[PDB]
Amino acid sequence: SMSYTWTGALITPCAAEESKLPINPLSNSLLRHHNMVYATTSRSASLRQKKVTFDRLQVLDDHYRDVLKEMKAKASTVKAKLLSIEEACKLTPPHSAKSKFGYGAKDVRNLSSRAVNHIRSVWEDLLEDTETPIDTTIMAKSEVFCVQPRKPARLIVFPDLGVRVCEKMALYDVVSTLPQAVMGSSYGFQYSPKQRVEFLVNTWKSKKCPMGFSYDTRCFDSTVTESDIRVEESIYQCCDLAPEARQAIRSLTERLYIGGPLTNSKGQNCGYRRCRASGVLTTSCGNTLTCYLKATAACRAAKLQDCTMLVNGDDLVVICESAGTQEDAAALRAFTEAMTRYSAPPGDPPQPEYDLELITSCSSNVSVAHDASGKRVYYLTRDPTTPLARAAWETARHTPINSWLGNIIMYAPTLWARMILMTHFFSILLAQEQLEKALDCQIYGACYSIEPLDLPQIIERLHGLSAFTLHSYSPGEINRVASCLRKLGVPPLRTWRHRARSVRAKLLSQGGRAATCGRYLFNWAVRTKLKLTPIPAASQLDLSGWFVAGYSGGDIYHS
């Protein structure tokens, strides 16, 4: 069937859309080529619609069915609990889109009588009506990028606030627990950046002669078929569930997940969806299971030997035993045709790689550096172009989500995050005296309220003390970073080093937590280093649940 059908009505904005980077002194000291930075808007929506609209092709075989049964056998060991209304309301982000029925996220979190009453009726309706398509809003997503040597806006589809709360009740425990039980070490969202690097490296070292590749499915969500979503539900149904949860899952599958009507911001009928919706609770879990299922069966069809896969939603990386240059290229080609029959055709053609560092998965690649003792340490990094473009944007315009904060946390060990992001933002935070003000950021899709002054402990716990002492980075990484800075008009690293010394001093002057940031975050700045010892209040922090599951588009907030 067609992934989408359109009536002709437009995907509209619900307010003015900013597309260009302003000329601001604060952002200009970070990035001068302000004209190279842009944000996507609804104006490019028709271009995206055209790309995600097509008839799907899907042929299932024995390999597919064997793998499905194996996954279900593992899912059979799970017992998922129904979340209470209170627990589900607490998982709702303070700024989540308000319901069109007279209440908002704040009311949901406060458990107001109106929000609670509407949520109960929505839940009851899910138990009674097993067929009626639930409405969804379709919007053009606003994302920042650097011009290429432009990208059309991604399309987000989500249901009303009341429905999102019910999804949590019926499926939160499932999507946070089932992937792990089914996929084991292959489930990517269970790893912190350090654990992910460790997994990739150990897996690479375990092979006699490793070969690996990332596999890019062209617009994954639109390739998800009605059958894929029903197979996905068949897996969830293997869990021990409360009667109402089982019905809720059955109803939500037929009424929301397999598809439904699309309504624009103006309340007009935009069309119909018969593929994965980006903004529902099961998107991350569902995409991971579907991608893992198809890739696993595809590997067998392709005769790939000793495969170890790592899946994060639609992002897939595979490491296996090489059978020779020609044999690998042909086997990879067969793998791609197998995935194509499964309705997972390639965007960028996959290429076999024999150097772990040349593989990009989850937008990252493994690289090497050295700690104080000169010992080699692997870490995750990436081309800093987008992170820097977004950092400049979030500096000039106040944004709800602070990607720069998430990047510092996730890429703390990298040359660019330490010398540029940390330096740039602490400088501004010091100047505006907002070092203690908490800010929102996202980690694996979930929203986190974090205080800049807690970064040292967070980084230690997540990456280890070596994150504050890495040096002697690889020439390729350095060159990639340097090339990026010249392209965007970002001052050279030497300038950042000089700015960091000034920031570090101001931090040390204030003492307390502020001074701790100076000692650990900027120890790379001073020639006469300080012996860095484990941070006291670090081993106490509650990072439980930080890296357990993916929730992209799931509307999840963690307190």
Task: Pick out its properties.
3-stranded antiparallel sheet; 20 helices; 2 domains; 559 residues; 13% strand; alpha+beta
Strand order of the largest sheet: 1-8-7-3-5
When the domains are counted, the total is 2
Please tally the β strands and state the result: 15
What oligomeric arrangement do these chains adopt? monomer
Our Rg estimate from Cα atoms comes to 24 Å
Q: Count the DSSP helices.
A: 20
Helix content: 40-55%
**Beta-strand fraction estimate:** 5-15%
Distance between the termini: 41 Å
Biggest pleated-sheet summary = 5 strands, mixed
Structural class: alpha+beta
Spatial shape: globular
PDB class: transferase
Keywords: HCV virus RdRp NS5B polymerase, transferase
Assembly: monomeric
Entry title: Crystal structure of HCV NS5B polymerase
Question: Please, could you describe this protein's structure?
Answer:
It is found in: Host cytoplasm; Host endoplasmic reticulum membrane. It catalyses: RNA(n) + a ribonucleoside 5'-triphosphate = RNA(n+1) + diphosphate. The chain has 559 residues and is an alpha+beta fold. It folds into two domains: 361 residues, no CATH class; 198 residues, no CATH class. 44% of the residues lie in helices and 13% in strands. The chain has 20 helices and 15 strands. The strands form five sheets. It has a five-stranded mixed β-sheet. A three-stranded antiparallel β-sheet has the order 6-10-9, with helices on both faces. A hairpin with a 2-residue loop joins strand 9 and strand 10. Helix 12 packs across helix 13.
